[PDB]
C-alpha cells in the first residue's frame, strides 16, 4: 500500500492518455487537448486501484500543451515547478516538529515517461533541452511513441541515434536495477531495449480466436501485447511491485536528496 506518481511529458496527441489506459488495462477519464494552449499546464489526476497486488494510490500527471507553442524556450518550467513543489511539501513534512510521515501522501514524481515522436532522425531540440532539465529531478524513461509508424530496420537505427545523443549530451536516464542477481539478466535486456518502442490501444481486434488489444489497419493488425510488434510488455514491467519500489527509492534517495541539499543550504542550514 503506497502511492505512485507518473509524469507524462510528450507532444499533444502523441498517445499519452491511450498508453496510460493500455498500461493499467482500464480507462481514466481525460479530455483531448487542443494545440492552442498559451502555456504548458501540469494536470494531475489521482486514482485508487490495485495493480500487481498493491493498494495503489496512482497519480497521473500530464504536461498539457507540451510542444504546441511557436516559442518553446521555457517550456520545462511548469514541469519543474510541479516536481519541485512536491519535493518542497515533502521537505516541509521533515522539518515539522510534530510530524506524521507514515500518514503523509507522497506526491513526488516517481517516473517520467518521455514520449519521443517517431520522426526517424535523432532527438528534437525540445527533447534535448527538457530532458537535460529533468534528468536530475525525475527517473526518466524514454519511450518512442506510435512505434507502429517505424519499420523494424528504421527503429533499430533510430534507437541507436537516440541513445547515442543522450550519452553525448550527458542525459541521465533511469536504469532498471542490476544488483539483485535474480533480476540481473532480465533487467540487462530491459535497459538494452531502451527507448521502449510502444503502441497503445484499448480497441479489441479478433486475431485468430482471441480478442487482443490492437490497432486495425487496412494492411494489418498491430497487436499491443505482441513483443515482436512493440515493447509495450517490456514497459509494463515497470508496474510490477519490485520496479515501482525501486523507482520510488531512487526518487527519495537520489532526486529528492539533491533537492533537499539545495533547499536546506538555501534556508541557511549547515
Amino acid at each position: 500500500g503506497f502511492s505512485f506518481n507518473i509524469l507524462c511529458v510528450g507532444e499533444t496527441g502523441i498517445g499519452k492518455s491511450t498508453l496510460m489506459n493500455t498500461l493499467f488495462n482500464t480507462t481514466f477519464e481525460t479530455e483531448e487537448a487542443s494545440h492552442h494552449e498559451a502555456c504548458v499546464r501540469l494536470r494531475p489526476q489521482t486514482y485508487d486501484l490495485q495493480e500487481s497486488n498493491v493498494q495503489l494510490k496512482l497519480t497521473i500527471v500530464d504536461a498539457v500543451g507540451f510542444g504546441d507553442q511557436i516559442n518553446k524556450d521555457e517550456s520545462y518550467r511548469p514541469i519543474v515547478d510541479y516536481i519541485d513543489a512536491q519535493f518542497e511539501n515533502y521537505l516541509q513534512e521533515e522539518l515539522k516538529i510534530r510530524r506524521s510521515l507514515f500518514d503523509y501522501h507522497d506526491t513526488r514524481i516517481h517516473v517520467c515517461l518521455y514520449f519521443i515522436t517517431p520522426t526517424g532522425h535523432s532527438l528534437k531540440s525540445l527533447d534535448l533541452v527538457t530532458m537535460k532539465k529533468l534528468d536530475s529531478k525525475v527517473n526518466i524513461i524514454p519511450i518512442i511513441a506510435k512505434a507502429d509508424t517505424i519499420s523494424k530496420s528504421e527503429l533499430h537505427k533510430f534507437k541507436i541515434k537516440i541513445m547515442g545523443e543522450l550519452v553525448s549530451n550527458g542525459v541521465q536516464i533511469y536504469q532498471f536495477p542490476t544488483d539483485d542477481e535474480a533480476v540481473a539478466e532480465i533487467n540487462a535486456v530491459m535497459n538494452a531495449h531502451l527507448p521502449f518502442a510502444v503502441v497503445g490501444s484499448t480497441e479489441e481486434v479478433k486475431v485468430g480466436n482471441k480478442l487482443v488489444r490492437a490497432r486495425q489497419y487496412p494492411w494489418g493488425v498491430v497487436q499491443v501485447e505482441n513483443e515482436n510488434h512493440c515493447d509495450f510488455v517490456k514497459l509494463r514491467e515497470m508496474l510490477i511491485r519490485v520496479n515501482m519500489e525501486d523507482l520510488r527509492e531512487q526518487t527519495h534517495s537520489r532526486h529528492y536528496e539533491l533537492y533537499r541539499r539545495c533547499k536546506l543550504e538555501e534556508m541557511g542550514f549547515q
Binding site: 507532444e11 499533444t12 496527441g13 502523441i14 483531448e32 487537448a33 487542443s34 494545440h35 492552442h36 504546441d68 507553442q69 511557436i70 516559442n71 518553446k72 524556450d73 515522436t117 517517431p118 520522426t119 526517424g120 532522425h121 535523432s122 532527438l123 528534437k124 531540440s125 525540445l126 527533447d127 534535448l128 533541452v129 511513441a145 506510435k146 507502429d148 509508424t149 519499420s151 523494424k152 545523443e165 553525448s168 549530451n169 490497432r215 486495425q216 489497419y217 487496412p218 494492411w219 494489418g220 493488425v221 498491430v222 497487436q223 505482441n226 515482436n228 510488434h229
Partner: protein, 267 residues
C-alpha cells in the same frame, strides 16, 4: 516549361522520401543532418535543386531547418524573402527593354506537410500558411498516412479542412471540370477534391504485395503499398500535380504575381 515546387514541413515527416517517390529522383545525395544540440537555434535555409523529367524542368525548393529551432525568431523570413525575390526577379525581367527568353523562377506550388501525430494543425502551421497564402498555391499534405486508421484518417482530414476555414487560410482549389471533358475526367476531378487534404505514404524500398514487387513499407503485421489508393493518397497527389501543373502556373501568374506587382509598383 519551368516549374518550381516548394516543400515546407517539420523535419522527419517523410518529405524527402515522398518527393523522390514522385519522380524517382535523388535530390538529396549530400544532406546536412544536425544533432539535437545543433538544431537548438538552427536557421531556416533554402536549398533548390533542378532536374529534367519527362518533358519539363522541375525545381524543388526545400527549407531545411523549418521548425527545428526551439524558438521561432522570424523563422519565415528566409522562406518569404525567397518567394518575394523570385517575384521581384520576374518583374525586373519582364520590365526590361531587351527582355528575351524569360526564365520563370516563381514558386508555383508549396507542399505543406502536416504531422499525422497530432489532433490537427499546430499554431506554427496556421501562422506559416497565413503568411504565404497570398503568395503561393498551398497544397496541404498529411505526411506518413500509415500512422492513421481509416477512421482516424477521416477525422483528421475533416478537422484540417475545418481549421483552414476557421483561420481563413487560402489553399489551392482544383478547377471544376468545365462541362466539356469526358466522363472519365469529370469523375477524376471530383474524386481528387473529395480526398483533400491528401494523406500520403512515400517509400524508397521494394516489397512483395499481391504477388508483385512494388514500392511500399514493410511491417511485421502487414505491408503498406505506395501505389495502392486503398492505402494512401499518393496516386491522387501525383495525378493532381501532373494534371494541374499548368493551372498552378496560371494562378501563380494571374493571382499571386499580379497581386505582388500591384502591392509593390505603387511606392
Amino acid at each position: 516549361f519551368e516549374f518550381t515546387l516548394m516543400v515546407v514541413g517539420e523535419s522527419g515527416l517523410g518529405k524527402s522520401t515522398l518527393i523522390n517517390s514522385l519522380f524517382l529522383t535523388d535530390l538529396y545525395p549530400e544532406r546536412v543532418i544536425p544533432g539535437a544540440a545543433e538544431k537548438i537555434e538552427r536557421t531556416v535555409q533554402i536549398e533548390a535543386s533542378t532536374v529534367e523529367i519527362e518533358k519539363l524542368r522541375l525545381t524543388v525548393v526545400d527549407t531545411p531547418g523549418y521548425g527545428d529551432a526551439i524558438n521561432c525568431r522570424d523563422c519565415f523570413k528566409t522562406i518569404i524573402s525567397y518567394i518575394d525575390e523570385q517575384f521581384e526577379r520576374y518583374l525586373h525581367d519582364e520590365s526590361g527593354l531587351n527582355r528575351r527568353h524569360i526564365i520563370d523562377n516563381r514558386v508555383h506550388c508549396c507542399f505543406y506537410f502536416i504531422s499525422p501525430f497530432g489532433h490537427g494543425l499546430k499554431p506554427l502551421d496556421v501562422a506559416f500558411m497565413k503568411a504565404i497564402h497570398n503568395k503561393v498555391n498551398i497544397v496541404p499534405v498529411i505526411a506518413k498516412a500509415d500512422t492513421l486508421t481509416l477512421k482516424e484518417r477521416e477525422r483528421l482530414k475533416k478537422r484540417i479542412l475545418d481549421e483552414i476555414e476557421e483561420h481563413n487560410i487560402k489553399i489551392y482549389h482544383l478547377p471544376d471540370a468545365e462541362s466539356d471533358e469526358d466522363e472519365d475526367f469529370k469523375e477524376q476531378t471530383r474524386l481528387l477534391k473529395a480526398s483533400i487534404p491528401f494523406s500520403v505514404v512515400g517509400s524508397n524500398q521494394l516489397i512483395e504485395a499481391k504477388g508483385k514487387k512494388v514500392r511500399g513499407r514493410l511491417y511485421p503485421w502487414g505491408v503498406v503499398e505506395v501505389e495502392n489508393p486503398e492505402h494512401n493518397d499518393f496516386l491522387k497527389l501525383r495525378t493532381m500535380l501532373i494534371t494541374h501543373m499548368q493551372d498552378l502556373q496560371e494562378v501563380t501568374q494571374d493571382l499571386h504575381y499580379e497581386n505582388f506587382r500591384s502591392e509593390r509598383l505603387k511606392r
